[PDB]
Amino acid sequence: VHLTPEEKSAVTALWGKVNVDEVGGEALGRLLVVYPWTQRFFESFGDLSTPDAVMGNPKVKAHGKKVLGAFSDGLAHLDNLKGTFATLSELHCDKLHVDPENFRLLGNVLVCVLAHHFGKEFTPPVQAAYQKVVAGVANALAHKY
Amino acid sequence: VHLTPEEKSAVTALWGKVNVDEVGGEALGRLLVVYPWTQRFFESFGDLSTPDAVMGNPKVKAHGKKVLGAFSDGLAHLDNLKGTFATLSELHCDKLHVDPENFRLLGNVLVCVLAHHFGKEFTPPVQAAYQKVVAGVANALAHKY
Amino acid sequence: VLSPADKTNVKAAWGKVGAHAGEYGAEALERMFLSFPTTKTYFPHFDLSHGSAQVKGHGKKVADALTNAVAHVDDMPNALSALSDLHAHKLRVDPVNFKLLSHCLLVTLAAHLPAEFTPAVHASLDKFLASVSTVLTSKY
Amino acid sequence: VLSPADKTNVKAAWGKVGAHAGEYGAEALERMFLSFPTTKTYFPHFDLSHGSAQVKGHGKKVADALTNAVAHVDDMPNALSALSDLHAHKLRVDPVNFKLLSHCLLVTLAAHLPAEFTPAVHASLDKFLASVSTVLTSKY
Ligand code: HEM
Numbered sequence: 228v229h230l231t232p233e234e235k236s237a238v239t240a241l242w243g244k245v246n247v248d249e250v251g252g253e254a255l256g257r258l259l260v261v262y263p264w265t266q267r268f269f270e271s272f273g274d275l276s277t278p279d280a281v282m283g284n285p286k287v288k289a290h291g292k293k294v295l296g297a298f299s300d301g302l303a304h305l306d307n308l309k310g311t312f313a314t315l316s317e318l319h320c321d322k323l324h325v326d327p328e329n330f331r332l333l334g335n336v337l338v339c340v341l342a343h344h345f346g347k348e349f350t351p352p353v354q355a356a357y358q359k360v361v362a363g364v365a366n367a368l369a370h371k372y
Numbered sequence: 373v374h375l376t377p378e379e380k381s382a383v384t385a386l387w388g389k390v391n392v393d394e395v396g397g398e399a400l401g402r403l404l405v406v407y408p409w410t411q412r413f414f415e416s417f418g419d420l421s422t423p424d425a426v427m428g429n430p431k432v433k434a435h436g437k438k439v440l441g442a443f444s445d446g447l448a449h450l451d452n453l454k455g456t457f458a459t460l461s462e463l464h465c466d467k468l469h470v471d472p473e474n475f476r477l478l479g480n481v482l483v484c485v486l487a488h489h490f491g492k493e494f495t496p497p498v499q500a501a502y503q504k505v506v507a508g509v510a511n512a513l514a515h516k517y
Numbered sequence: 518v519l520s521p522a523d524k525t526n527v528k529a530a531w532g533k534v535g536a537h538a539g540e541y542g543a544e545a546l547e548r549m550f551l552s553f554p555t556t557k558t559y560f561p562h563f564d565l566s567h568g569s570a571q572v573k574g575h576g577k578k579v580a581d582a583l584t585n586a587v588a589h590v591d592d593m594p595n596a597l598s599a600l601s602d603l604h605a606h607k608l609r610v611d612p613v614n615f616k617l618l619s620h621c622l623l624v625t626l627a628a629h630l631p632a633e634f635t636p637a638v639h640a641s642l643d644k645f646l647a648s649v650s651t652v653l654t655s656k657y
Numbered sequence: 658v659l660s661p662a663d664k665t666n667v668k669a670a671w672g673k674v675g676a677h678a679g680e681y682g683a684e685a686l687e688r689m690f691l692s693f694p695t696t697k698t699y700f701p702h703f704d705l706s707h708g709s710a711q712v713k714g715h716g717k718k719v720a721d722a723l724t725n726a727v728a729h730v731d732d733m734p735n736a737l738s739a740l741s742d743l744h745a746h747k748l749r750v751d752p753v754n755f756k757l758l759s760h761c762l763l764v765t766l767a768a769h770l771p772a773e774f775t776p777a778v779h780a781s782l783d784k785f786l787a788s789v790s791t792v793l794t795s796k797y
C-alpha cells in the first residue's frame with residue numbers, strides 16, 4: 228500500500244493513543260457478535276455464547292492484542308506486507324485460509340471500534356487512511372504462502 | 373499465482389481450443405445481462421438495451437477479444453501478474469478502478485461460458501485450475517498502479 | 518423479487534435436470550470442493566473423493582431442496598425454514614460459501630444443458646440461487 | 658428477518674440521531690467518498706468538498722429515507738419501492754456500494770453515539786442496513 232505522508236501521519240498519530248490491551252479484543256469480539264459464523268474459526272477459544280461472554284473471553288482479548296500487533300507490523304512495512312506476514316500465516320497451518328472477506332470484515336469492525344473510542348478525532352480523512360491499511364493487511368493475510 | 377503442472381496443463385490444453393473471436397464477447401455480454409450495473413462501466417459502447425442487443429454489440433464483441441487477450445497474458449506470466457497488467461490498467465486512466473468484485477464476476481462468467489462451450493470436457497479439476505487464474509487476473513487488474 | 522419470467526425460466530431449466538437432479542447436485546458440490554477448498558472444512562467427516570457415495574447422497578439432498586424451493590417459489594422463507602435454521606444457526610456456514618456453491622450450480626447447468634442456458638435463463642437462475650442463498654443465510 | 662429486539666435496538670439508536678439526522682447522513686456520505694473513491698463517480702456532478710451544501714442536502718434525504726424504513730420496518734419493500742426502482746433500475750448502482758455506505762453509516766453512529774453503540778446494537782444496526790440494502794438492490 229502506498230500511503231501519502233498526510234495519510235501516514237493521520238494513521239500514526241491516532242495509533243499511538245490506542246489502548247493496546249483492549250481495542251484489539253473489542254474488535255475481535257464485535258466480529259464474533261456481528262458476524263457469528265466467525266466463531267467457528269475460533270472453536271478452540273471456548274465460551275463464545277452471548278455478546279457479554281464473547282466480549283469477556285480471555286483468549287478473545289489475547290488474540291486481540293495480536294490483531295493490533297499485526298496491524299502495527301503492517302504499518303511499519305507497508306511496501307512489503309507479504310514479506311511482513313508470510314511467517315504469521317505460515318505458523319497457523321490452515322487457520323488463516325478463510326475467505327479474504329472475513330479479514331475485510333475484521334478490518335471494518337476495527338474501524339468501527341476506533342470510531343467508537345476516538346469519536347470526532349476519527350475524522351473522515353483519518354478513517355480513509357485507515358481503510359487503505361486495513362485493506363492492505365486483509366489482502367496480505369488472505370494470500371496463502 | 374502458483375499453478376501445478378497438472379493445473380497448467382488443464383488450463384492450457386482447453387485454452388488452445390477456444391474460439392478467440394466469440395468466447396470473450398459471450399462472457400462480457402452475459403456480465404452485462406446477468407449483472408446489469410456493469411453496463412454503466414461501458415457507457416461508451418452504445419446499445420446495451422436487451423439480452424440480444426448486448427450479445428450483438430460490436431464493441432462488446434471487440435472488447436471480448438481483449439478480455440481473452442488479457443487472460444492469455446496472465447497465463448503466460450503467472451508469477452508476475454502485476455508486471456503483466458500495469459500498462460493495461462494505466463492506459464485506461466480510471467476505467468479499471470471499479471470494485472475488485474466486478475473483475476471476480478467477469479472471471480466467473482468466463483467460467484460459465486467455458487463450461488457452456490466445452491460441456492463435459494470442462495471437468496471439475498479443469499474448472500478448479502481456471503478459478504485459480506481468474507482469481508489472480510481479477511486481483512491484478514483491480515490493483516491500481 | 519423474482520419476476521414471472523424468472524419463475525418460468527427457472528422451472529423450465531430446472532425441469533431438464535430431470536432424473537439427473539441428484540448427479541448434478543453432486544457434481545456442483547465436487548466443483549465447489551476442488552475450486553474453493555475452504556469449503557471442505559464444513560465436511561471434514563465426508564469422504565470427498567470423486568465418486569463418493571456420500572457426496573452423491575448429499576448432492577441429491579441439495580438438489581431436492583432446490584426443487585422444493587422452485588415448487589414453492591412464492592413462499593421460500595416458509596418452505597426453507599428448517600434449512601435456514603440449520604445452515605445459519607446450527608452449522609454457522611459463512612455466507613460467502615453460498616455464492617460459491619451457486620456459481621458451481623450454474624457451471625454444472627451450463628455444462629449439461631447448453632441449449633437451455635441462454636443469457637436470459639442464466640440471469641434468471643442466478644437470481645433464483647441468490648434468493649435461495651438469502652433465505653438460507655437469514656437466521657444467524 | 659429482523660427480530661423484535663433488532664427493531665427496538667434500531668428505533669432506540671436511530672432515535673438519538675435526533676435532529677442531527679441530516680448532519681450524520683452527510684458525514685457518512687463524506688466518509689464514503691473519501692474512503693471509497695469509486696463511489697464519487699455516481700456523483701460527478703455534485704460538489705463533494707467538505708461543507709458542501711449539496712452533500713448536506715443529500716445527506717438529509719438519505720437519513721430521511723432511513724427513518725422512513727425504521728418507521729415501516731415490517732413493510733420495507735413497499736415503503737422503499739420508489740427508491741429501489743431509482744437505484745437499481747434507473748441509476749444502476751453497483752450493489753457493492755451499499756455495503757460501503759452502510760459501513761460508513763455505522764462508523765458515523767459509533768463516532769457520535771458511543772453510549773448507544775454497544776455490540777448488540779451494532780449487530781442490530783448492521784442487520785437493519787443490510788435489510789435496507791437488499792430492498793434497494795432488488796429491482797435490477
Ligand atoms: C482464526 C483463528 C485463529 C486461531 C485459532 C489462532 C491460534 C493461534 C495459536 C494457537 C497460536 C500459537 C501461540 C499461542 O498459543 O498463543 C497463534 C499465534 C499467533 N497468532 Fe493466531 N490464531 C488465529 C488468528 C489470528 C489472527 C486473525 C491474527 C492476526 C491478524 C493472529 C495473530 C497471531 C500471532 C501474531 C501469533 C504469534 C504468537 C504471538 O505473538 O502471540 N492470529 N495463533
Ligand code: HEM
Pocket residue numbers: 413414416435438439441442460464467468513
Ligand atoms: C471497463 C470499461 C472499459 C472501457 C470503457 C475500455 C475502453 C478502452 C479504450 C477506449 C481503449 C483504447 C483502444 C480502442 O479504442 O480500441 C482500450 C484499450 C484496451 N482495453 Fe479496454 N476498456 C475497458 C475495459 C477493459 C477490460 C476489462 C479489459 C481486459 C480485461 C480491456 C482490455 C483492453 C486492451 C488490451 C486494450 C489495448 C488496445 C487493444 O489491445 O485493443 N479493457 N480500452
Ligand code: HEM
Pocket residue numbers: 556559560578579580582583600604608610614615618619649650653
Ligand atoms: C444452494 C445452497 C444449499 C442448499 C439447498 C443446501 C441444502 C442442504 C440440505 C438439504 C441439507 C440437509 C441434508 C440432510 O438432511 O442430510 C444440508 C446440510 C448441510 N449443508 Fe447445505 N445447502 C446449501 C448450501 C451449503 C453450503 C454453501 C455449505 C457449506 C459450504 C453447506 C454445508 C452443509 C453441511 C455441512 C450440511 C450438514 C452435512 C452433513 O453433515 O450431513 N450447505 N444442506
Ligand code: HEM
Pocket residue numbers: 696699700718719720722723740744748750754755758759789790793
Ligand atoms: C442506505 C443506502 C441509501 C439510501 C437510503 C439512499 C437514499 C437515496 C435517496 C432518498 C435519494 C433521493 C434523493 C432525492 O430525491 O433528491 C437517493 C438518490 C441517489 N442515490 Fe442513494 N441511497 C442509498 C445508497 C446509495 C449508494 C450506495 C449510492 C452510490 C454509491 C447512491 C447513489 C445515489 C445517487 C447517484 C442518487 C441521485 C443523486 C442526485 O443526482 O441527486 N445511493 N438516494
Ligand SMILES: [Fe+3]
Pocket residue numbers: 323
Ligand atoms: Fe485469526
Ligand SMILES: [Fe+3]
Pocket residue numbers: 468
Ligand atoms: Fe474493462
